[PDB]
Scaffold this active site. Structure first.
Site, mmCIF file in Angstrom:
data_model
loop_
_atom_site.group_PDB
_atom_site.id
_atom_site.type_symbol
_atom_site.label_atom_id
_atom_site.label_comp_id
_atom_site.label_asym_id
_atom_site.label_seq_id
_atom_site.Cartn_x
_atom_site.Cartn_y
_atom_site.Cartn_z
ATOM 1 N N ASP A 97 0.821 -1.210 0.000
ATOM 2 C CA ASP A 97 0.000 0.000 0.000
ATOM 3 C C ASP A 97 0.856 1.262 0.000
ATOM 4 O O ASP A 97 0.557 2.227 -0.694
ATOM 5 C CB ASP A 97 -0.933 0.005 1.214
ATOM 6 C CG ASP A 97 -2.315 -0.575 0.906
ATOM 7 O OD1 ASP A 97 -2.508 -1.133 -0.199
ATOM 8 O OD2 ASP A 97 -3.214 -0.468 1.775
ATOM 9 N N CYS B 263 -2.461 0.120 -13.552
ATOM 10 C CA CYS B 263 -2.554 0.114 -12.101
ATOM 11 C C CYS B 263 -3.788 0.959 -11.825
ATOM 12 O O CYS B 263 -4.816 0.734 -12.460
ATOM 13 C CB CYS B 263 -1.285 0.651 -11.434
ATOM 14 S SG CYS B 263 -0.487 2.042 -12.293
ATOM 15 N N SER B 264 -3.718 1.926 -10.912
ATOM 16 C CA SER B 264 -4.874 2.796 -10.738
ATOM 17 C C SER B 264 -4.866 3.919 -11.779
ATOM 18 O O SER B 264 -5.854 4.129 -12.495
ATOM 19 C CB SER B 264 -4.947 3.364 -9.317
ATOM 20 O OG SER B 264 -6.201 3.990 -9.116
ATOM 21 N N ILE C 52 0.477 4.695 -14.579
ATOM 22 C CA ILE C 52 1.768 5.330 -14.825
ATOM 23 C C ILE C 52 2.866 4.905 -13.849
ATOM 24 O O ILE C 52 4.050 4.869 -14.214
ATOM 25 C CB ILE C 52 1.656 6.896 -14.844
ATOM 26 C CG1 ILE C 52 1.128 7.425 -13.504
ATOM 27 C CG2 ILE C 52 0.764 7.359 -15.994
ATOM 28 C CD1 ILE C 52 1.008 8.968 -13.441
ATOM 29 N N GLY C 53 2.476 4.590 -12.613
ATOM 30 C CA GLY C 53 3.445 4.306 -11.559
ATOM 31 C C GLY C 53 4.037 2.912 -11.638
ATOM 32 O O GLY C 53 5.145 2.715 -12.155
ATOM 33 N N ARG C 54 3.292 1.947 -11.102
ATOM 34 C CA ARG C 54 3.631 0.536 -11.196
ATOM 35 C C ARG C 54 3.630 0.089 -12.659
ATOM 36 O O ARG C 54 4.504 -0.638 -13.075
ATOM 37 C CB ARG C 54 2.637 -0.318 -10.405
ATOM 38 C CG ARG C 54 1.787 0.445 -9.422
ATOM 39 C CD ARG C 54 2.181 0.156 -7.997
ATOM 40 N NE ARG C 54 1.181 -0.642 -7.305
ATOM 41 C CZ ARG C 54 -0.029 -0.213 -6.938
ATOM 42 N NH1 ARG C 54 -0.434 1.020 -7.217
ATOM 43 N NH2 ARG C 54 -0.854 -1.039 -6.307
ATOM 44 N N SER C 55 2.635 0.520 -13.425
ATOM 45 C CA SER C 55 2.601 0.216 -14.850
ATOM 46 C C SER C 55 3.922 0.663 -15.479
ATOM 47 O O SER C 55 4.544 -0.081 -16.236
ATOM 48 C CB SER C 55 1.439 0.935 -15.534
ATOM 49 O OG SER C 55 0.187 0.441 -15.089
ATOM 50 N N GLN D 75 6.266 7.316 -10.622
ATOM 51 C CA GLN D 75 5.571 8.375 -9.899
ATOM 52 C C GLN D 75 6.303 8.877 -8.672
ATOM 53 O O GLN D 75 5.858 9.825 -8.038
ATOM 54 C CB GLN D 75 4.185 7.900 -9.462
ATOM 55 C CG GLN D 75 3.121 8.001 -10.531
ATOM 56 C CD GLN D 75 1.743 7.662 -9.992
ATOM 57 O OE1 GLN D 75 1.428 6.494 -9.730
ATOM 58 N NE2 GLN D 75 0.915 8.685 -9.815
#
Length: 298
Positions: A181, A215-216, A219-222, A262
Site C-alpha cells: 500500500d 494500475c490505478s 503510470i506508476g507501477r505500470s 511516480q
C-alpha cells in the site's frame, strides 16, 4: 554493471530525489486535448493523468472514440505496451473493447481493486465461472474460465466474445496482488518472477497485439513494469549490454505517456529490478528458480 555502479553512487550520495526531479524536468510535454474535452470528463479517473493526443488509443466507435490509454512503442526493443488507468464503473465496456480492437492477448494488473481503504478501479472481470459479464454498450461478453491463485500473483484465463460476430478469444489476466500500500516491494524478486510469468505466457510477443498494463492511474507501477521489461530486453539484444541507460529509456517512454514512474522510490526500485533481473540474462539459468523459491506460491 555500469548501472549498479551508478546505483551505488546515487545511493551513497543520497540523490534519488534530485535524479527523479531531473527526469520530471526533462520529460516530454505534449497536448492532451481530446482527454480534456468536457464530454470526456467522466472517462478520466484523475484529471491529473491524461493520454497525449498523438499516442492515445482510439476506440473504433463513431460516437466517442476516447479512452484513457496510451500506446507505448519501443522501437529498438521491438516491444509495444498499452498503458491505461484502472477501468471506471462506466468504462469497463470501453476497456474490453480496446482489448478486442487492439488484439491484445494479455492484461497486466498491478493494483488491488481496493487499496488504502478506497476503490482503485472497478471490478471489471467476473469472479465466478458461472456469473459471466455482459458489456451492453460495447456488446461484449466476458467469462471467467479458470483462476490460479499464488502467493504473490494470480493468473486467470478469460474468454472474451464479440457478441456482434460471436468470435471469441482467450485473454490472459496477470494480477500482481502484493504490491505494498505504501512504498515499494523492497526486494524485486517477486516482481521479477511476475514479469517472467507474463513473458512466458506469450502475451508480450509480436504475434499478438500489445499487452494492456494498468494500475490505478496507469503510470506508476505500470511504468515500472514496462521500464524493467524494456531495459532487460535491450540488455539481451545489444552488443554492449552496459550501454543500457534506464533514465534514457524512461525518458523515451515518457514521450508516449506522462508521469511514468511516480516517485523517487519507484525509480530506485526500477534500477533494483533491472540490476537483479540482469543476473538471469548473462548465463545464470539457476536464478529463475531462485525467484520462485525466494517468494512462495501457495
Amino acid at each position: 554493471m555500469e548501472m549498479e555502479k551508478e546505483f551505488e553512487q546515487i545511493d551513497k550520495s543520497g540523490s534519488w530525489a534530485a535524479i527523479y526531479q531531473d527526469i520530471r524536468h526533462e520529460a516530454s510535454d505534449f497536448p492532451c486535448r481530446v482527454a480534456k474535452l468536457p464530454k470526456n470528463k467522466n472517462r478520466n479517473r484523475y484529471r491529473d493523468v491524461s493520454p497525449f493526443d498523438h499516442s492515445r488509443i482510439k476506440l473504433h466507435q463513431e460516437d466517442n472514440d476516447y479512452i484513457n490509454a496510451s500506446l507505448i512503442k519501443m522501437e529498438e526493443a521491438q516491444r509495444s505496451y498499452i498503458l491505461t488507468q484502472g477501468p471506471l464503473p462506466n468504462t469497463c465496456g470501453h476497456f474490453w473493447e480496446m482489448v478486442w480492437e487492439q488484439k491484445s492477448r494479455g492484461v497486466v494488473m498491478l493494483n488491488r481493486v481496493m487499496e488504502k481503504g478506497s476503490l482503485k478501479c472497478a471490478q471489471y472481470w467476473p469472479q465466478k465461472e458461472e456469473k459471466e459479464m455482459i458489456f451492453e454498450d460495447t456488446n461484449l461478453k466476458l467469462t471467467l474460465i479458470s483462476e490460479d491463485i499464488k502467493s504473490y500473483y494470480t493468473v486467470r484465463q478469460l474468454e472474451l466474445e464479440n457478441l456482434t460476430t460471436q468470435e471469441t478469444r482467450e485473454i490472459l489476466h496477470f494480477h500482481y496482488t502484493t504490491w505494498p500500500d505504501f512504498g515499494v516491494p523492497e526486494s524485486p524478486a517477486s516482481f521479477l518472477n511476475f514479469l517472467f510469468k507474463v513473458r512466458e505466457s506469450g502475451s508480450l510477443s509480436p504475434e499478438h497485439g500489445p499487452v494492456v498494463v494498468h494500475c490505478s492511474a496507469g503510470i506508476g507501477r505500470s511504468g515500472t513494469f514496462c521500464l524493467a521489461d524494456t531495459c532487460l530486453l535491450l540488455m539481451d539484444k545489444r552488443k554492449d549490454p552496459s550501454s543500457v541507460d534506464i533514465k534514457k529509456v524512461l525518458l523515451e517512454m515518457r514521450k508516449f505517456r506522462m508521469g511514468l514512474i511516480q516517485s523517487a522510490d519507484q525509480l530506485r526500485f526500477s534500477y533494483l529490478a533491472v540490476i537483479e533481473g540482469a543476473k538471469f540474462i548473462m548465463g545464470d539459468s539457476s536464478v529463475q528458480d531462485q525467484w520462485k523459491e525466494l517468494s512462495h506460491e501457495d
